Amino acid sequence: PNEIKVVYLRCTGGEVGATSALAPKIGPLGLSPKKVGDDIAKATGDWKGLRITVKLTIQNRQAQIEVVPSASALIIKALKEITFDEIVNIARQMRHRSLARELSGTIKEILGTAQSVHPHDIIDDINSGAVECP
Amino acid sequence: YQTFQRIVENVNVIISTYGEGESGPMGNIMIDPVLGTVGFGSGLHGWAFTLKQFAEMYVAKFAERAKKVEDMMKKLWGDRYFDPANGKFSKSATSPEGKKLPRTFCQLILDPIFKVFDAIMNFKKEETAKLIEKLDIKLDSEDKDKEGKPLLKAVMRRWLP
Amino acid sequence: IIEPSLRQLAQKYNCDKMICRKCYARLHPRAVNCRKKKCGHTNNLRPKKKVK
Amino acid sequence: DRATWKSNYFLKIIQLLDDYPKCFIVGADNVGSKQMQQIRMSLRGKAVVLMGKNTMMRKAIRGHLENNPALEKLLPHIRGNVGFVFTKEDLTEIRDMLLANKVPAAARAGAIAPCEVTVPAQNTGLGPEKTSFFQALGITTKISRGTIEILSDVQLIKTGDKVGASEATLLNMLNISPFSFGLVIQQVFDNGSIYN
Amino acid sequence: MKTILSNQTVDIPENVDITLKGRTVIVKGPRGTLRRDFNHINVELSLLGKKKKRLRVDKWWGNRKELATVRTICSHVQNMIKGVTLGFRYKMRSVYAHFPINVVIQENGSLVEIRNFLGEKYIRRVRMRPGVACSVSQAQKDELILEGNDIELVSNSAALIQQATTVKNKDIRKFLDGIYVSEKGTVQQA
RNA sequence: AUAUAGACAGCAGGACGGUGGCCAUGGAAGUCGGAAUCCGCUAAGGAGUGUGUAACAACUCACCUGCCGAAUCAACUAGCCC
Ligand SMILES: [Mg+2]
Ligand SMILES: [Zn+2]
């Protein structure tokens, strides 16, 4: 595995942080990124989203790329700054979309009340877009 | 032997983790009783020994001497097993007959020492004298009179300074 | 040094027990009421505190 | 809530057994919820799997047996942690895939191990700060290139014995393949037929 | 409330026989004879058949406290059967942190000497109950084996050994040293 | 109130995915705190009753299932006794 691997996740986002962040505390696990690694990771991780932004990174032995899983609350807080049905319909297209599913409506039922932080009348009597995604 | 291995393993892992590796200039720094960086005994009674001394005395029983003991120590210590009945070394935990074999380290270092320990603690004069003759332990006056723990200290000092 | 299974065996008799809050009696770990009259067989029990 | 749950369950069982004519009864060993999700995803494409209460199973297949005969001969055989997989495919195609998709279960503490495994003499590949478990178990390990090496073959586990916590955590950190088990077919039922 | 009748039946194996002398039960099996009287309990004991040897314990017009005694008598009789057929063996382990506990088994296993408990110079002499034999196990390095026919005698002897090695004036959650009953089982495993 | 659509108690498993859910952040990832209680797999699972890990982790509970085959559980109340 190239003698070192970067499977570990992060829970930092929004402000750059750097020294205030725990990235120097992760540092001794791999010794590769250090400050010149977490700064350049945060450079691409400034947005998508502007929140805690739990995300995974992949190491190329010199630089890191970052992929942010499509967390429901993360993406809805990124969207926020009403129904807004279409944006939550389209936000689930690029996710992992497993959710122990049996139909496409399960994911939108999940996110409709994940937005509850009332978005429950739709959950009660929804009759739209049951097979929209497939 | 297990306690000695625990301590040796602890030393090796501590230096390996908290210092430079073998690729560093100092090279292989992790200790080995087979190499001779590990010593035993007690400074309270003034007796100490390494694998080197017992390997030397066993080669003497059985340049050239240094080359013999250098690779003799590699069998003196390790997870190797010597059968007192067979009279030769073995690398297998199970004997052809089925009897469990003692390890080489215990069987031909700690076993004569435990014989002299038991003899001198239980006051077996015949055992102590015969072990002295079998190990050519040199003793002087005022030391050949005592028996017990002081004689244990004296014999350990004289046989294994 | 004590190996973990022997430590567990010792702790079964020495540490894994209940204490009555009223009369400090040492009770079996599944106790609900104290076995002693002087506290009135009370059900105010607590775990025996650990060395941790 | 409970009564409606049981009634809906009865309706589901009767409609499923009417819909699917071929079903294999399959025992569930010490299997996890992750394995349940994996089997559900890997099997929901072509067939369905059912794993609930045995009393529910016997009552559903006994009380409402009048709709089709040649079913009561399952009754003296549905015992233990067992369920029904309903399929329209055939026995070999179900059996080979279900015997192939076995997740390599680890060595959970407190679990019996009828199978036998033995650690070989090879480098661990981890840092030399985990010698405590090896020394507690009684394993001779020495430093080599900054990694822990097993210098001698030792007996790890026998058949039909309890697994200690130290052994379980050793097999957890060793990243090796321990004894494993999963959902195993007990027998079959194809329109009133019992085979292996 | 007075219950009219509370009865419980104990089956007797073929290799062991039971004789009643009033409320005194004499159980003779391959390993010996265990005799115990229950004259402190007002029950009726009867042997039922010449075929399978059932022993019935009956209590008539008993309240709750004396209904509790029927299964006590039955369990005692079952323990007697178990003792005379398979025997009772208690395995104890001596645990210590620094000072090894040296155990010496004196004549015929009837006396146990504990030497170095917590490093003190006192010698603990514990005398086993009659019919109980103590021994030092050859399978484990620190293990006592107490074997006998009477479960109460064997367990009382084990309790004496356990209570002799008691840490005093120290934190017992830290000073875990002593001899503890590791397991309870039978001899002959049959 | 539960229970042959098999209670209760014991013994044995699962107790998840999104999600190491959001705002709290220096780790709080289910449990130092503020809000809300989603969905699906279903046999069930609280985006958590507790232990605890610096934190991970590893346990436990409520929830279901297996063995077990007949009744059981809870909260009160008031007589004597303590
Ligand atoms: Mg004090
Ligand atoms: Zn009390």
UniProtKB/Swiss-Prot annotation, chain A:
Pfam family, one: Ribosomal_L11_N
UniProtKB keywords: Acetylation, Cytoplasm, Isopeptide bond, Phosphoprotein, Ribonucleoprotein, Ribosomal protein, RNA-binding, Ubl conjugation
Gene Ontology CC terms: cytoplasm; cytosol; cytosolic large ribosomal subunit; cytosolic ribosome; extracellular exosome; focal adhesion; membrane; postsynaptic density
Positions of post-translational Phosphoserine modification: S32
Any GO molecular function: structural constituent of ribosome
Top-rank taxon, per record: Eukaryota
Cross-linked sites for Glycyl lysine isopeptide (Lys-Gly) (interchain with G-Cter in SUMO2): K34
Subcellular location per the Swiss-Prot or TrEMBL entry: Cytoplasm
Positions carrying N6-acetyllysine: K48
InterPro entries: Ribosomal_uL11, Ribosomal_uL11_C, Ribosomal_uL11_C_sf, Ribosomal_uL11_CS, Ribosomal_uL11_N, Ribosomal_uL11_N_sf
Record has Nucleus as a keyword: no
UniProt GO BP: cytoplasmic translation; translation
SUPFAM superfamilies: Ribosomal L11/L12e N-terminal domain, Ribosomal protein L11, C-terminal domain
HAMAP family, per database record: Ribosomal_uL11
Function, as annotated: Component of the large ribosomal subunit. The ribosome is a large ribonucleoprotein complex responsible for the synthesis of proteins in the cell. Binds directly to 26S ribosomal RNA.
Assembly and binders: Component of the large ribosomal subunit. Mature ribosomes consist of a small (40S) and a large (60S) subunit. The 40S subunit contains about 33 different proteins and 1 molecule of RNA (18S). The 60S subunit contains about 49 different proteins and 3 molecules of RNA (28S, 5.8S and 5S).
Protein name, as recorded: Large ribosomal subunit protein uL11
Organism the protein comes from: Homo sapiens
Originating gene: RPL12
From Swiss-Prot, chain B:
N6-succinyllysine found at: K88
Post-translational modification: Phosphorylation by CSK promotes SUMOylation, proteolytic cleavage, and nuclear translocation if the C-terminal fragment.
Modified residues (N6-acetyllysine): K61, K88, K91
Cross-link entry Glycyl lysine isopeptide (Lys-Gly) (interchain with G-Cter in SUMO), positions: K138
Compartment(s) where it occurs, according to its Swiss-Prot or TrEMBL record: Cytoplasm; Nucleus
Residues reported to bind GTP: S42, G43, L44
Disulfide bonds: none
Modified residue annotations for Phosphotyrosine: Y81
Positions bearing Phosphoserine: S141
Pathological condition linked to this protein in its record: Spinocerebellar ataxia 26: A form of spinocerebellar ataxia, a clinically and genetically heterogeneous group of cerebellar disorders. Patients show progressive incoordination of gait and often poor coordination of hands, speech and eye movements, due to degeneration of the cerebellum with variable involvement of the brainstem and spinal cord.
Entry function: Catalyzes the GTP-dependent ribosomal translocation step during translation elongation. During this step, the ribosome changes from the pre-translocational (PRE) to the post-translocational (POST) state as the newly formed A-site-bound peptidyl-tRNA and P-site-bound deacylated tRNA move to the P and E sites, respectively. Catalyzes the coordinated movement of the two tRNA molecules, the mRNA and conformational changes in the ribosome.
Annotated family: Belongs to the TRAFAC class translation factor GTPase superfamily. Classic translation factor GTPase family. EF-G/EF-2 subfamily.
Protein name as it appears in the record: Elongation factor 2
UniProtKB/Swiss-Prot annotation, chain C:
Modified residues (N6,N6,N6-trimethyllysine): K22
Resulting phenotype, K22 to R/A: Abolished methylation by SMYD5, leading to decreased translation initiation and protein synthesis
Modifications after synthesis and translation: Trimethylation of Lys-22 ('Lys-22' of the mature chain) by SMYD5 promotes translation elongation and protein synthesis.
Entry's localization field: Cytoplasm
Function: Component of the 60S subunit of the ribosome. Ribosomal protein L40 is essential for translation of a subset of cellular transcripts, and especially for cap-dependent translation of vesicular stomatitis virus mRNAs.
Name of the molecule in the record: Large ribosomal subunit protein eL40
The species this protein was found in: Homo sapiens
From Swiss-Prot, chain E:
Subunit note: Component of the large ribosomal subunit.
Function: Component of the large ribosomal subunit. The ribosome is a large ribonucleoprotein complex responsible for the synthesis of proteins in the cell.
Major site of localization recorded for this protein: cytoplasm
Keywords: Acetylation, Cytoplasm, Ribonucleoprotein, Ribosomal protein
Example of a GO biological process term: cytoplasmic translation
Name under which the protein is recorded: Large ribosomal subunit protein uL6
SUPFAM superfamilies named among the record's database cross-references: Ribosomal protein L6 (SSF56053)
Membrane spanning stretches: none
Family classification: Belongs to the universal ribosomal protein uL6 family.
Listed GO MF terms: RNA binding; rRNA binding; structural constituent of ribosome
Lineage, top ranks: Eukaryota, Metazoa, Chordata, Craniata, Vertebrata
Location of N6-acetyllysine modifications: K121
GO cellular component terms listed in the entry, alphabetical order: cytoplasm; cytosol; cytosolic large ribosomal subunit; cytosolic ribosome; focal adhesion; membrane; nucleus; ribosome
Organism (species): Homo sapiens (Human)
Compartments, as annotated in UniProt: Cytoplasm
